């Protein structure tokens, strides 16, 4: 929120949070202080009766390391766009891939869940992504209320150097070729929603040569989700089947994967919101003798207390069900439990 | 610029932009997503009838790489100052070298042009620079603007030539000064001259193969027509040991010319054509005379309003691919840019 | 100052400065341009009659290096908290260790002094630190005016990897184990104050194994200080004894050290504020033959001219009293004088 400017048809909204956060875990790469902050600007300019221009930026600033540490801040979102009334909207930039239009329904845990679990950022069109052009349509041209669809194109983001390069090169794990995706969601009743999403991206030559795991020309996702949100109850599930698109930790990609997330929450009137969730990711046909493997498997229990719209506190308990094996060790996949405590100021 | 605070003689202006930008080119180090944003603050405090204090900060944040990429944000401007009525001003910090008081006149292309082309940032007093003390004067104690500027040494990371804020030789400078002079001859027509002189550093005279000399110098003259929906401007600059011969060093002498023509239609379209070249002379290692930069630029911006615009820009590269361009890493390919921009 | 948002019980203060600054010195690691800026946000939300929530972020951005330079920006403060009227306050995040509730009394020099001198940042609870939980009480529950106290806990911040690691690892010089601290200040009059602070932290394995200097399982600080601040006069002194806590430059820690700082200032009505100060740090029982060594010793003389509350200019002159010896050279400790000139815009 925090509208700091509204004058002559132009609006500026400064938003963010300061999340004082500690993790407790036997996993030493996760354990300890996790304090961070986010700061953002949402901007809007009226051009004419039918046309609005807009932009948005969101920055993540870690505060859990020293004043001499490196790489402590990064851009989550940065895009500019036009809204054409009910003919739709178009924006280009670093934005969410459309698959998250459905998987976001389960991204509601007090602390865990979302990107980093069954999917990641810079992971084709599953979460935040460089260089997405996104068309969105509301209520199917003002005709069918509650029916939303989106169409998305992403240009190649390639290697640092050599034949596969682009200006903005990165590691094979965060590369993509040309790709597209589409999402569709419908509020069948009030409170109840269904949704589908699909994506198709070319893979790069580095993705097919450098890591040992995952081979194929194309990465694909198919997602279906359901959501109940009403009477102080929140239930949601997401099922996603992927091809060459799910990270098998640090070792590469899974040729096939099946991802499942489900969550249930209740909002009490005095501000407490308990939460229980289950998440799994099942990888199939992995090279080097790995075969079928659990990529992710945990039960999540926790709660958030909302003091008001600007302040909350929370605990989250990740009960890790993975068995420690040679795949989990070599891929860097944590098999330990984790508790999180946080105190959050939001603006 | 959005005024977010104005109370008790202190004002605070928040400004910036989000530039959704894609490049298309066979040069793979240029091609692809180039989305970035800029954010800044301009602050002004009334001290007395004859004295105002001010500061400004401008930050660049790239948004075209991943959340684990490094070195994606940097400060472009950061300076504090005093304004003594109309009798001029003084500021210290990271700011534009006074040469840009004239070369800024051709820095108006939809996307290309400006720093990175005939001159760069951290390039003596040609653009943005660390540690510049700048005295400016309107109406020469009429309509005649004068600046005098000093810059302290910015030297090597370590060794003899070090300062606290060390960097590579391409972005080093010794003690230097500059001066500029601009004048509105008619209404709409301006002329301008600028000169800079800086000591070079020991690393600049020892690590790169190209460019030797104790001093860097720039002589610039420029003209501008800006009236009747028409914008014409040119800039001619001669340099000694000051212009970068790509990654190979500096050019002992160079001649840079920039010219641009634009028209601004009432309904918001602004076509643009421009020509830029940089001619390097007397280069070591058998290079002799060499084109450093040569291209025609065509494109256009459509302004929806003062806060939103779209643009296309086409760089028609005229450099020939040769031993110098390859070794110095100078691109010879064309580029097309497409962008959509929100500004506040 | 700069309240940019105050609406429905929520307020937001945008603060910072732009410091145009140049150092003159024969020390090449210090000499030259030092321009930098600070930006931050103080936020506060009223929750109920007895409870206020708040948070604060402060970022430091260097502007003295190039647009391709590395590691030019960092977080100084990031914390979130709750204030429960006169039962106290609690916050967690990156914040000041409580030792600084006393040593801050001498951190008033025009430019020098403060962190970097007798103590540094990420230096146990002596200054800004990762992951401190801080309980504060002012006026002793409302019963004794001018009596303030603090209790503080800090989780381990360990190595980058290995046995001693946490998620947010750093080098041995900025590491800490589990630790606590306490402070107590009393305003005897409304200008005269006395204060004490204590801290105790576990040392980490790398602090005992990598550097040459300093051995021990615990880091301890004892600090007493005095302050006179009224009638335009400012006198302040601080004495601190440390054990395994004071940095011996790059060589490690001093098994014990004695730090002394004293400063006197006067505020003229036209805005000039002269300052003289003296600072020293005496290290004892150093290994490798060093024995007793001066770690820091200098006299400071300077002045600040305030144009108003938003703009000032200053000179500061550090007259360095260290002998150039084997210790100072090997520990990277500067022995040269420094002059600073600055012009500062603040909001």
Automatic annotation (TrEMBL), chain B:
Q: How does it sit in the membrane?
A: Multi-pass membrane protein
| KW Transport (keyword) present | yes
Give an example GO molecular function.
porin activity
Compartment(s) where it occurs, according to its Swiss-Prot or TrEMBL record: Cell outer membrane
User: Which InterPro entries does the protein's record reference?
Assistant: Gram-neg_bact_OMP, Porin_dom_sf, Porin_gammaproteobac, Porin_Gram-ve, Porin_Gram-ve_CS
Pfam families linked: Porin_1
Q: In terms of domain of life, where is this protein from? A: Bacteria
Principal localisation: membrane
Do you know which Gene3D superfamilies this protein is assigned to? Answer: Porin (2.40.160.10)
Q: Name one GO biological process term.
A: monoatomic ion transmembrane transport
Keyword entries, A-Z: Cell outer membrane, Ion transport, Membrane, Porin, Signal, Transmembrane, Transmembrane beta strand, Transport
**Cellular component terms per the entry's GO annotation:** cell outer membrane; pore complex
Looking up PANTHER family in the UniProt record yields: OUTER MEMBRANE PORIN C, PROTEIN YDDL-RELATED
User: Which protein family is named in the record?
Assistant: Belongs to the Gram-negative porin family.
The UniProt entry, under NCBIfam families, shows: PRK10554.1
How does this chain assemble?
Homotrimer.
* Designated name of the protein: OmpK36
Q: Which organism is it from?
A: Klebsiella pneumoniae
